Amino acid sequence: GPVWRKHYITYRINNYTPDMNREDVDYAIRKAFQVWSNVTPLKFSKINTGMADILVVFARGAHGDDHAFDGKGGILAHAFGPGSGIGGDAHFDEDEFWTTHSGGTNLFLTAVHEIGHSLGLGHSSDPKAVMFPTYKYVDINTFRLSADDIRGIQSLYG
Numbered sequence: 043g044p045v046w047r048k049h050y051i052t053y054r055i056n057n058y059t060p061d062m063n064r065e066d067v068d069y070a071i072r073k074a075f076q077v078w079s080n081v082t083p084l085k086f087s088k089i090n091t092g093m094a095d096i097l098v099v100f101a102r103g104a105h106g107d108d109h110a111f112d113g114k115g116g117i118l119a120h121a122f123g124p125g126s127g128i129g130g131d132a133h134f135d136e137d138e139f140w141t142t143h144s145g146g147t148n149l150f151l152t153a154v155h156e157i158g159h160s161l162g163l164g165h166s167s168d169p170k171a172v173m174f175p176t177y178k179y180v181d182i183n184t185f186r187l188s189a190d191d192i193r194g195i196q197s198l199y200g
């Protein structure tokens with residue numbers, strides 16, 4: 043289904059997990075948008091008020107779409123594919139402990155997977171792909187998209 047039909051995309055952070063330093067949320071989501079723009083024609087800018095394309099949300103339990111969070115573990119996060127309104131939005135379970143590192147749940151790695159969803163990608167059956175449906179920590183410092191990921195996103199864009 044959907045793909046954005048424009049090159050300039052905006053995101054807004056709804057609120058911040060108390061799990062992390064503010065700046066570290068900003069940076070993690072920024073780095074995660076850079077992953078996809080590296081391999082597409084898209085450009086991603088953080089606006090701080092009004093309607094973004096992609097709204098980034100921290101929330102627990104019933105948070106008012108249909109995709110209720112399940113407490114700590116299980117479903118870590120979910121996102122909507124492109125489209126108007128809620129399309130694009132990416133939602134992180136505040137019942138997880140979000141981190142900049144190997145501990146709890148790495149927000150960067152998770153945000154990369156969700157932005158893939160915000161962008162029109164589904165899951166991959168490759169355990170090496172960031173779009174594989176099982177969260178596995180890998181060094182974020184040397185993180186690199188799997189070739190499966192690149193083919194899938196370039197299947198939609200560019």
Ligand SMILES: O=C(NO)[C@H]1CCCN1S(=O)(=O)CCc1ccccc1
Pocket residue numbers: 116117118119120121151152155156159172173174175176177178
């Ligand atoms: O895929 C998902 N969300 O987008 C949900 C539905 C089923 C598995 N998960 S998950 O949130 O638990 C983790 C998926 C994931 C994959 C790689 C990196 C982070 C998270």
Ligand SMILES: [Ca+2]
Pocket residue numbers: 111112113114115116117118135137138
């Ligand atoms: Ca959860």
Ligand SMILES: [Ca+2]
Pocket residue numbers: 094095096097125126127128129130131
């Ligand atoms: Ca939206």
Ligand SMILES: [Ca+2]
Pocket residue numbers: 059060061135136137138139140
């Ligand atoms: Ca938390």
Ligand SMILES: [Zn+2]
Pocket residue numbers: 105107109120133
């Ligand atoms: Zn949600």
Ligand SMILES: [Zn+2]
Pocket residue numbers: 155156159165175
């Ligand atoms: Zn997913």
